[PDB]
Nucleic acid binder design. Structure first.
Length: 17
RNA sequence: GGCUCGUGUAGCUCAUUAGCUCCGAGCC
């Protein structure tokens, strides 16, 4: 998690599914 | 790692509604 959640899994695999 | 899929028991960035790495899927 960051200053929002996670954005992604690091090769475009974008998070909040 | 090169790339693609899966919030998941998760971390690290500073994003930009995100990003990169895990923890698995599949093949280098």
């Amino acid at each position: 998690s960051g200053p929002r959640p996670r954005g992604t899994r690091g090769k475009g695999r974008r998070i909040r599914r």
